[PDB]
Symmetry: C3
Subunit: 402 residues, 3 copies
């Protein structure tokens, strides 16, 4: 009976929902207290907007029967099915759409206008996430007998749980947004001057990191597509990817004597988790440890590099979700068991199609949003006024009276 | 084997327990910091008191073989059974008793004496919740072969997971309490003057709302009574009810330019969830969206209305749990598939018995507590002294030294 | 098929992971804000260090085929198995190693150097936890056909989920640490003078207590070793142990009019849970209530006693985890159904072997760490400098610039 798998997917979707709690804590604690309420408002609003969009038409665009191969075109206002796994799958996939979009808020914090962020959320949920999703995962409908692969999927692109599909998409859109709104006031000065701006509730960011970690077990577990005796290995690999991402960054912080090491260590854990998201089902425990640990290190160096580039990513979305997601997606070709690849593929062939997916994601999730958000910003400024930035977005639109 | 259903109910009970974490966060962040520790003490104490009461005799009163039909009279000090689903069921039902009662603390915050609140908790757990529970749900014992319906249940009253039984009961008792202790100092002035009093950790209230949301999946899932292929639809409906409650309130807040929109949006999500609690198993996804969205709107207008009535409900218990619970309970007759009704019932017949349950709940959970708490208050003042209100209940009985 | 049990163990391991979130909240809220970030850094770092150690060799030492009976010697870098339950089991057991060690941070807070704590964590994870674990639980490998019992296990020592193995081990090592680093500045004065030092985010400690509670269901549930119709009784007993621990302390606090009752009540809940950890599978609901309630009372009196001894245990690790763990381990002989004992054992025989395990744990987890940590402290001071204590460990190594 379809019962055990349905129950499994539903519990995994519950775990994905706790990731939304995780992000709210992670982001809100990493900002100053004068912004922390606006952060909270962004994090509940995006969830509601994304869920409404995904239910109304995003699931249709992503998973419906492919019209030309670019997009799906049935499953609007999702309700009834003759596929007894589909409804569980739909709920789980709705939680992934919410995850991809909510990544963006942490990069743009402390100076993006609320309504501006919600419009970006609409673009993510309505167009960018479901269309890329179709291309990578369009054929991958749980319990379906009549599915057709998206075009990247058809070429052999592998992404077990969304290193590219969820995390890179969000990260590319975040990068676009921070380039357009610009750095916080007081972040960068002179030519090479960098000031750190620290959050006011870093303990809540640690809670948040643990909630994200917990949720990631559902994120990866619910993507497995079945139950067999190798499911527990996905969970070990998830644990090792996160813990080695953190451990490696802890070692680096001890070695470098890093200021506010906590932020780097937590980001290391998250980067480790993102990197194994592509391959949790296809690698050994040693390679999970390796891929996660490397991901952690990369997040550390990428944080430092973004600062040198005068790009202000408040919680390090790009180091964690984008650099981690790219690394994980390419790492799959280096480390995964080749039996998970198309029969006619070497590791070089697999590397090339993983790379094509990475580049395609970048062109569509960075290039198109960059152009569209730059256009929106010209007629509807996305950056708050200086007064609102200085007083804090708690005092912004829909907040407190100053 | 009874194994899968038992495991399911136990995991669902775990999820209900995280709702207690949710309430603690939701309430404590919505008060001023000088009250937030007292809030925490209320939220752990009520859980322990309710659990002890329910185990000792509340489960007997609620689910035991009906003595005259008003009350059960076996299952005291719950221990052993020959029903292999009963023990899981008992634990799940204990978590519901704790949920109904803990709703009350959020309405009465910042000026109800701790011991006064614990006495109200005893009244909820010992008398009001289990007796109403018997009348609505007395026959509904998981895996039982020999159960007899309560009298409302027998008449056709439907409440899938406790829009009335849990949420309205708590809300009615909360209303009684706020009318008796009166408004906070500084809340209302002149004839029409209203001051907002904002909480000091609104990010924690967003965390809390997500924890409540997560828990609600267990709340509804554990009430399903079995496993079949339509269980996943309960989870979709739960997701849509919450997300549409929030989305609708977000739209209203954008339209009205509302002050401290975050509080209304979070309350919209919770109201949406409460409304679908009555009918999650019997409605379509579109109707879940509709019922939840309407519930959200109602919570917004009900908040404003309570202020006009000079009734001080700190976290908006009555807008969320009582107005949401009533709306959901009546909505069941409008929207649910008629195959879930007694064979001899039109939608009008179903509307009338839903209404009878609503009114019966009000008379017993508002009318009786109003009379008993007004009596208690005469000999044991439930409102703190002005000094304790001003300094904060952190400095009250069992708190800090001033 | 092994499927349902594997899925069960994996969900239980997820619940154990939320206990790590619980500890982070419980500890960080119970310290002053100038220490709360260091607390968070300790709580994520220890998790990563323990996981790496347990994966690399701790699981080998604890559960590998016994070399002389003191220690295991295979399962290094855990990867592949022919036991289809082993991988799930390994992940669950990794979470237990992390739990035992992370207990220590709460006792030593506000004046132990970060690197000093991480070294103690290495000692816990690398030597103390896995070797004691072997002696108590070495034969208890899920789904194994060829296991040999550890020497205490062989003598009849019973510990269902780790009242001794997890909680007493951590508590003994915590005691050693607080004796060596000494009391916080301003805690004790004159000869009998005691100042309370209160945490700055006690609401977060209530959240933490609920997260711990929730996790404990997985902690006990995942230790059951199978699925049968008595599993739900483990969950009832867990609920009752916690709720009676809290309720009993609430009564005592009301009776004594105790200052900052919240801290005692939360600790009562945790102590109740620790005590039932030894016996959740082998006692009635009444005895769970009794054992938990007594555990709560003991935690209250033990807190007061430690102060009289001028021992500074910040969050009351020793009252909760050590006194609770000892009480629970001995209580098993008094209350458990004798069918769970070796056939040739009276309750007196069972009491004696429970006591031998308690004493053995103390000699090895207190005596050896006391000697080794006193030695480490001579060449690498574990107590922060007075300046760092006064300014707060947020400004310590790896923290903020002062
Ligand atoms: Cl912000
Ligand atoms: Cl704004
Ligand atoms: Cl209060
Ligand atoms: Cl009080
Ligand atoms: Cl500390
Ligand atoms: Cl330090
Ligand atoms: N979010
Ligand atoms: N977010
Ligand atoms: N509560
Ligand atoms: N509550
Ligand atoms: N930890
Ligand atoms: N800890």
């Amino acid at each position: 009976e379809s019962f055990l798998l349905n129950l499994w997917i539903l519990l995994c979707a519950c775990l994905v929902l706790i990731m939304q709690a995780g992000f709210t804590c992670f982001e809100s604690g990493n900002v100053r207290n004068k912004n922390s309420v606006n952060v909270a408002l962004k994090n509940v609003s995006d969830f509601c907007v994304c869920a409404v969009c995904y239910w109304a038409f995003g699931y249709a665009l992503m998973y419906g029967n492919s019209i030309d191969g670019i997009v799906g075109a049935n499953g609007f206002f999702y309700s009834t099915t003759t596929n007894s796994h589909e409804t569980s799958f739909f709920l789980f996939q709705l939680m992934f759409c919410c995850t991809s979009a909510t990544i963006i808020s942490g990069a743009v914090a402390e100076r993006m206008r609320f309504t501006g962020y919600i419009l970006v959320t609409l673009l993510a949920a309505s167009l960018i996430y479901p269309l890329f999703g179709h291309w990578a995962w369009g054929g991958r409908i749980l319990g379906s007998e009549t599915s057709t692969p998206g075009w990247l999927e058809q070429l052999g692109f592998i992404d077990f749980a969304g290193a590219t599909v969820v995390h890179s998409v969000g990260g590319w859109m975040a990068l676009a947004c921070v380039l357009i709104i610009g750095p916080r006031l007081g972040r960068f000065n002179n030519k090479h001057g960098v000031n750190q701006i620290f959050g006011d509730n870093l303990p809540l960011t640690a809670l948040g990191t643990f909630l994200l970690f917990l949720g990631w077990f559902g994120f990866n577990g619910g993507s497995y597509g079945k139950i067999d005796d190798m499911l527990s290995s996905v969970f070990v690999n998830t644990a090792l990817g996160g813990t080695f991402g953190g451990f490696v960054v802890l070692l680096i912080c001890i070695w470098q004597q890093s200021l506010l090491s906590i932020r780097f260590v937590l980001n290391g854990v998250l980067a480790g988790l993102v990197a194994i998201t592509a391959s949790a089902n296809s690698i050994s425990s040693i390679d999970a440890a390796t891929i996660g640990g490397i991901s952690g290190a990369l997040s550390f160096f990428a944080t430092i590099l973004l600062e040198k580039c005068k790009i202000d990513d408040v919680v390090s979305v790009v180091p964690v979700h984008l650099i981690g997601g790219i690394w994980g997606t390419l790492a799959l070709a280096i480390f995964a068991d080749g039996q998970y690849f198309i029969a006619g593929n070497s590791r070089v062939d697999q590397f090339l199609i993983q790379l094509l997916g990475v580049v395609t994601c970048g062109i569509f999730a960075f290039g198109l949003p960059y152009m569209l958000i730059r256009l929106l910003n010209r007629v509807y400024p996305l950056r708050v006024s200086p007064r609102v930035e200085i007083l804090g977005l708690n005092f912004g639109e829909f907040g407190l009276k100053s």
